[PDB]
Amino acid sequence: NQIDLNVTCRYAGVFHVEKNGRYSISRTEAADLCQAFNSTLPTMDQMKLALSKGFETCRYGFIEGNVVIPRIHPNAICAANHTGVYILVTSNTSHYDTYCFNASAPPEEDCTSVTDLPNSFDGPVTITIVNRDGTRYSKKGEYRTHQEDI
Ligand SMILES: Cc1c(N)ccnc1CN1CCc2cccc(N)c2C1
């Protein structure tokens, strides 16, 4: 009864979250996950500003309306060598990572660790935040409000 949430640096408040290091988050779970970080799914405009501050990943994740990958450097294995906010057009499947937006974060690059999941609710799950530098924070709780996600 354990969930790992791997989180990135924030860029203009936007960050990437993956669950157990594999694509495994539904659209409903993504919204709930961001809410647990006192965050929201980013708008396209928010994500484009994050990109302009240095944000890129090699992973599909939800934003409010689309599934995207922010890309600064062309890479043939990430978003078919595209740059900019690459939008996923055609897929059979529904589970990705997510992006989240925290308005209270610093305006540019914030590569400090995340040490809390402030808006998690009471629950039985051991939830571990895992930073890219390995730094961890664990707590017992839950964040999923839809039964189909559990
Ligand atoms: C690189 C990679 C992959 N090959 C498959 C799935 N996910 C990733 C990206 N992950 C890799 C693992 C990890 C651990 C802690 C924080 C962060 N941000 C990350 C980012």
Swiss-Prot record:
The chain holds residues 22 to 171 of 778 of the full protein. It comes from Mus musculus. Residues 13-102 form the Link domain. Glycans are attached at N6, N38, N81, N92, N102. It comes from the Eukaryota. N-glycosylated. O-glycosylated; contains chondroitin sulfate glycans which can be more or less sulfated. Expressed in the intestinal epithelium. Disulfide bonds join C9-C111, C34-C100, C58-C78. The lectin-like LINK domain is responsible for hyaluronan binding. Cell-surface receptor that plays a role in cell-cell interactions, cell adhesion and migration, helping them to sense and respond to changes in the tissue microenvironment. Participates thereby in a wide variety of cellular functions including the activation, recirculation and homing of T-lymphocytes, hematopoiesis, inflammation and response to bacterial infection. It is found in: Cell membrane; Cell projection, Microvillus; Secreted. Hyaluronan binds at R22, R59, Y60, Y86. Interacts with PKN2. Interacts with TIAM1 and TIAM2. Interacts with HA, as well as other glycosaminoglycans, collagen, laminin, and fibronectin via its N-terminal segment. Interacts with UNC119. Interacts with PDPN (via extracellular domain); this interaction is required for PDPN-mediated directional migration and regulation of lamellipodia extension/stabilization during cell spreading and migration. Interacts with RDX, EZR and MSN (via FERM domain). Interacts with EGFR. Interacts with CD74; this complex is essential for the MIF-induced signaling cascade that results in B cell survival. This is CD44 antigen.
